């Protein structure tokens, strides 16, 4: 999935666990997953 940089302003949505932010919820909701049960491997997806 090769895409560019979507034109989005500030981010109204701000995570509650850490305090992150995102222009769209879909981006945040998927982020919270990082907190929900910490894995041994860790968030790398490299």
Residues that bind Zn ion (CB under 5 A): 15, 17-18, 20
CB atoms within 10 A of CB 11: 13
Give the span between the Cα atoms of 20 and 15, in whole angstroms.
Answer: 5
Residue 2 or 41: the one with the smaller Cβ distance to Zn ion is: 41
Pairing type for strands 21-22 and 13-14 reads: antiparallel
Question: Which CB atom, from 4 or from 14, has the smaller least distance to Zn ion?
Answer: 14
Minimum distance from residue 3 beta carbon to Zn ion (Å): 23
Cβ-based nearer residue to Zn ion, 8 or 30: 30
């Amino acid at each position: 999935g090769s895409s560019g940089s979507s034109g989005t302003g500030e981010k109204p949505y701000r995570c509650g666990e850490c305090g992150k932010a995102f222009a769209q919820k879909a981006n945040l909701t998927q982020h919270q997953r990082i907190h929900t049960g910490e894995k041994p491997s860790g968030p790398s997806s490299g």
